[PDB]
Symmetry: D3
């Protein structure tokens, strides 16, 4: 029942890591409730990162997240939000532990391969923001 | 430039083979131009099967193809249509060689895990049928 | 010389995770001293979980562990007991770290894919309880 | 329904290929109906080779097949006997195609890592010889 | 005893396929007798291509083979020369079967990821040309 | 720009773990700036472990590191020194976490599969000690 939003960022897609990452989630046992390759519009990127609109890395952040196609998805399963968060590893790749997605695939904070909803509330919000209602199965 | 349509069938999705299959296409070097989880409707299924209509197993097929969500995609690359047919292996798993998708993942023709356009024309037809134009990137 | 008992539970077997899990142990360098697919009898399950006989989840626990075939084994190698315990990860999948067996394959405490002897004493006891003496090589 | 007998030979076991090989059969979709680590006795080995008896390498074979523990198993699935012969590849590794077990893991016919029943009848014969009835699940 | 020369081309190195390719040769059972990252010089490249000289694409080839670092190696094992040609698959990826290196990793003959000695004599010639004697172990 | 020295020890090479380990680094995104199979000379081993020259395990240590060929390399990338150190895991395999190289492949401190420069200074020193200047690309 519980759902979380996940996004394989432009770098992850360009480096051909989509299947590998998705396999980790299926292997874990989560259900794919939604999935799609998509181009983040300038607007979506600004809404999504509104939180950091004042920050100084905001411009470069928006430029990165829209630099290429991303793979958006919604994973379903018991405590999927917290578990997916643990699977991704620390935001700053330098602190992400091995066995973790960022720990195994990312090297810098700027291009950290993936995003996972931080909380239940963030998830509900991100899902409505990235997917159309009928796209959830 | 050349592109093909691929569909991971309901059996492939429920068995959690989506990532593994996508990974093979990515390691091969093909570009993912479109991708999405979707539910095939009765009408849609029947439209896709226009020649296999006056055939027999037609109903039993539609039943399976609509039995659950499928993962649709478009792959791009040199001779990708013929190349993907080769990667999938024979339609009937028993005749598909080890190393191919159906050879390594399927056991019956009923649930042969995946579908790939037979020709460039079939691909164009399938792409227009399963994807909206804006979903192609 | 040191040995530990490991069991891939009914869920792990049903989800086709036996080879993958066994590969992690061979890759680690441990020796397979015993191995067998088996059905846990009502009696064995009760003996094995005697510790939690009074608990409330006992009935459902016994029902799960006997719900289907399991793969029992004995691994041999330096500090194998403690190392195998670390490899499995926390009992409650929610706390199991990525790279860990439960961390990568389990989502709930009820069906946590695998068991590993907790101590040397538990190992000796579990081994005699699950395997016949001549089955150890 | 249909079933076959498979044996990971002593070389396959010592090289730690048990999990990887089992994983291929599991991802393929076959059911594991029996499995066990065992030591083949002199008599047992000779009984298994009844026609190859008046042959030459007979002794050198028995020597190898009894040189260490083997992993015996029974696999179930549609046309599993022929399908497994295809998955193993040619008896002599040099003629086994990449993607098959012997093609990817073996280099000599002497130690060709695995054995699989040649026919349904050979399978029944091998199953009755290597497994007790109660070991079949 | 028998040995062959293998070169992971510039495209294979930049795409980060070195480990995956080496892993296949190791799981196969071949011994690595020599290995090194190197930059092929103009002269060196041309010397390697002595017969393909009066040919056409010669310059376009040298351009690619010297376009970046390559990983050179010598593999040892029974019939390793023919065996490695089989593992690499057809020179042109479109004709290479799934399961082979070029079949699973390449799409164009221009950048077909890897090279392997065609004969024992070519191997000796290539080994003397790319490796100093002391680099053979 | 930053570089670190890594060495797959004799055990790792003998167990055929080179490709697998190298793949983890390419997957991570680091660049291979140098690579070569080599035999550590008595002198090099003594220089490298001069730090522990007084210790009691020194003799056995030198004997191990020179017991067979090793694969030496230099990895390049952002904070590669610290990240590679984290990827390898604790020196004593017993304390190395799963998902970590030693955590997944090593069982004892004596034969712990791999080495990674501890600091920037150690790296510069190890690189000049193991590789010739022209071998860095
Ligand atoms: N006995 C059968 N039982 C169930 N489905 C069958 C049977 N025979 C054929 N099919 C179905 O028929 C279709 C086969 O298509 P066709 O023979 O025209 O070429 P194809 O390359 O296999 O196409 P596809 O990729 O869709 O399988 C598939 O959708 C398959 O599942
Ligand atoms: N030159 C040889 N050296 C060592 N063993 C050999 C040699 N030739 C054949 N063998 C052995 O002979 C047997 C070959 O069996 P056979 O040719 O009847 O069919 P098969 O399908 O290969 O059977 P199997 O699965 O047991 O290998 C194997 O056990 C194999 O190891
Ligand atoms: N159209 C082409 N474009 C670019 N390179 C080509 C083309 N045709 C052939 N080549 C190059 O020609 C060489 C083919 O060698 P050859 O046909 O003699 O046998 P081979 O077994 O393929 O050798 P190799 O392992 O070096 O590819 C390769 O180096 C390949 O990249
Ligand atoms: N130093 C930094 N440079 C660039 N981007 C940063 C930096 N610090 C944080 N960010 C960005 O802000 C966001 C942090 O939010 P959080 O959801 O906790 O992490 P993440 O998005 O990496 O999962 C990410 O989009 C991240 O890239
Ligand atoms: N909340 C719970 N629900 C179901 N089973 C539980 C619960 N808490 C503990 N258990 C069961 O009790 C046992 C705990 O013993 P332990 O050996 O430390 O862990 P595990 O068996 O998971 O390795 C397991 O069989 C586990 O499934
Ligand atoms: N108890 C021990 N037995 C054998 N060798 C040891 C022991 N303790 C330390 N060493 C050796 O000393 C070195 C420790 O240095 P360090 O660079 O921190 O670890 P490592 O080389 O394992 O990465 C290694 O070469 C290690 O094998
Ligand atoms: Mg098809
Ligand atoms: Mg056989
Ligand atoms: Mg070649």
């Amino acid at each position: 029942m519980e759902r979380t939003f996940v996004m394989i960022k432009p770098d992850g897609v360009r480096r051909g890591l989509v299947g590998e990452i998705l396999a980790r989630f299926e292997r874990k046992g989560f259900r794919i409730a939604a999935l799609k390759l998509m181009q983040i519009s300038q607007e979506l990127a600004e809404r999504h990162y509104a939180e950091h609109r004042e920050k100084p890395f905001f411009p470069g952040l928006v430029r990165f997240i829209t630099s290429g196609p991303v793979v958006a998805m919604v994973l379903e399963g018991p405590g999927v939000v917290a578990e997916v968060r643990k699977m991704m590893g620390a935001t700053h790749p330098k602190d992400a532990l091995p066995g973790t997605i960022r720990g195994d695939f990312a090297t810098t904070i700027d291009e950290n391969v993936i995003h996972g909803s931080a909380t239940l509330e963030d998830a509900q919000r991100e899902i409505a923001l990235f997917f159309r209602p009928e796209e959830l199965l």
